[PDB]
Amino acid sequence: LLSLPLVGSLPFLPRHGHMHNNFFKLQKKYGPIYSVRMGTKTTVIVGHHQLAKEVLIKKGKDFSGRPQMATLDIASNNRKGIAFADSGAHWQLHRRLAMATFALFKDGDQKLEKIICQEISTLCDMLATHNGQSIDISFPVFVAVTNVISLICFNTSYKNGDPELNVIQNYNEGIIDNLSKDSLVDLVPWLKIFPNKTLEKLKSHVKIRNDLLNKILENYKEKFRSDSITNMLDTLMQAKMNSDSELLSDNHILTTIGDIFGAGVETTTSVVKWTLAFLLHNPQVKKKLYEEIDQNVGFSRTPTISDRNRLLLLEATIREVLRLRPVAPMLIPHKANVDSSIGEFAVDKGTEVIINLWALHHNEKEWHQPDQFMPERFLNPAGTQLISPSVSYLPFGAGPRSCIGEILARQELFLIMAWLLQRFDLEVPDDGQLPSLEGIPKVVFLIDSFKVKIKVRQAWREAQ
């Protein structure tokens, strides 16, 4: 007897468990870095913080490419924009101009905190009308963060009830659903093996997004003034005006805006939902957050960015959400721009390189009870200082492809949660259902929809 000819072998079953956890589980057997080959393409998975910092920082510019994928081509109008653009002149310029835009929001009256706090004030007024009811907070949050990013991109915001917000919500959901079935990392290219309409559906969602962004962009050509640079579109059109010209085509500007607009809405809304869900599961933590805000902010005023110096448990809670349920548990796929190496192992040019951030955030040697939600791990024993308990922590990535929206994200998350906790009791709905914390890996790590009972806090009422 003889062993069977083997035509293919994969180390775990496809579509069974979360990909980021399956890869992590493999490290027990093969170590923290290993490879898989599908047809002619090789993918390397990295699951230890030293190798990841080599890829992202030390040799960051060797591994700053993006792999090409059929779905990503459609969302990115063929690898324009930032997030899905390959390393190259177009990416570098648009990333730099996007980053420079955030500097226009450093100080003054258009300061970032002021834009955020005004949209949070409307959100809170809206939620307060639901006093005593159980609601899904997704859309009210989505609206506030959509208005924040719309103001950053264009200096415009949507009035309550504007049907465009429902149009955007609809295509956002459709693009996320069709961009990947689970994570962006897939061992088997199912799209190309069996007949399906995934690409056709994605194109129809992206066409609506593109048509909407095209209308704004064209209408803005009439408003743009060399003498007034106050938002992201101004910044891009100024660079075009002073132009390289080919790298700032209308389609290039549109896709970069769509990347910022899309990232500014989906990332922040998801993290807010996760934070509320963990707090419904951990009432002891929620109780201490009320005490911390009642003692440090009170009700004389609304929370401010400066309050990050005092609401330490709230900052730790957010840090712990981003550790336990990272927005991007495998970042976005990287690619070797040149022949290089990771941990002394050769990596050819063109190899896809995946950083398993989940593995970094759940490494047993780097963290105590990594499966557990414990905001106190980011505080000292007294609870008087924030600490960095581990170097194996990279929620925003690092190096050339690191998140450019980090400052916005941290301010939005902190302010939304501080305003909500000052004003609202947030409780399990009356049928006793808790949110599932298992999550749904998509291009972003989403949580299942859930309801929360909302009540205006008595302490707030008494104080008015």
The option from ligand HEM, ligand UDJ, none interacting with 443 (CB < 5 to 8 A, set by class) reads ligand UDJ
The option from ligand UDJ, ligand HEM, none interacting with 329 (CB < 5 to 8 A, set by class) reads none
Q: Which DSSP state fits 149?
A: H
DSSP 264-332: HHHHHHHHHHHHHHHHHH-HHHHHHHHHHHHHHT-SSS---GGGGGT-HHHHHHHHHHHHHS-SSTT-S
- H or E stretch at 36: strand 33-38
Residue 147 interacts with ligand HEM (CB under 6 A)?
Answer: no
Q: Which is nearer to ligand HEM, 252 or 453 (CB)?
A: 252
The option from ligand UDJ, ligand HEM, none interacting with 395 (CB < 5 to 8 A, set by class) reads ligand HEM
Show the tokens assigned to 68.
């090409």
Q: Which is nearer to ligand UDJ, 178 or 422 (CB)?
A: 178
From CA 333, how far away is CA 84, in angstroms rounded?
9
Binding residues for heme: 403
CB atoms within 10 A of CB 176: 18
User: Which positions from 244 through 283 interact with ligand HEM, judged by CB under 6 A?
Assistant: 259-260, 263-264, 267-268, 271
Residue 322 interacts with ligand HEM (CB under 6 A)?
Answer: yes
Could you tell me the CA-to-CA distances from 67 to 42, 59, 71, 73, 295 in Å, in that order?
Answer: 11, 17, 11, 10, 50
Q: How many residues are recorded in the chain?
A: 464
Q: Which is nearer to ligand HEM, 134 or 169 (CB)?
A: 169
Minimum CB separation from ligand HEM for residue 408, in Å?
5
Residue 327 interacts with ligand HEM (CB under 6 A)?
Answer: yes
Could you tell me the CA-to-CA distances from 24 to 48, 73, 139, 346 in Å, in that order?
Answer: 10, 28, 34, 21
Residue 441 interacts with ligand HEM (CB under 6 A)?
Answer: no
Residues lying near ligand UDJ in the complex (CB under 6 A): 75, 83, 171-172, 175-176, 179, 209, 258-259, 262-263, 266-267, 327-328, 403, 443-444
User: Which positions from 400 through 429 interact with ligand HEM, judged by CB under 6 A?
Assistant: 401-405, 408-409
The option from ligand HEM, ligand UDJ, none interacting with 331 (CB < 5 to 8 A, set by class) reads ligand HEM
Q: Are 97 and 241 in contact (CB under 8 A)?
A: no
With contacts defined by CB under 6 A, how many residues of the chain interact with ligand HEM?
25
Nearest CA-CA partner of 255 in 209, 320, 313: 209
Residue 396 interacts with ligand HEM (CB under 6 A)?
Answer: yes
Minimum CB separation from ligand HEM for residue 330, in Å?
9
Q: Which DSSP state fits 436?
A: P
Residue 7 backbone phi and psi in degrees, to 5: -100, -20
Binding residues: 172, 403
Q: Which is nearer to ligand UDJ, 282 or 402 (CB)?
A: 402
- Angle 378-273-334 (CA atoms, 0-180°, nearest 5)? 70
- Contacts with ligand HEM, residue ranges (CB under 6 A): 82-83, 95, 259-260, 263-264, 267-268, 271, 322, 327-328, 331-332, 395-397, 401-405, 408-409
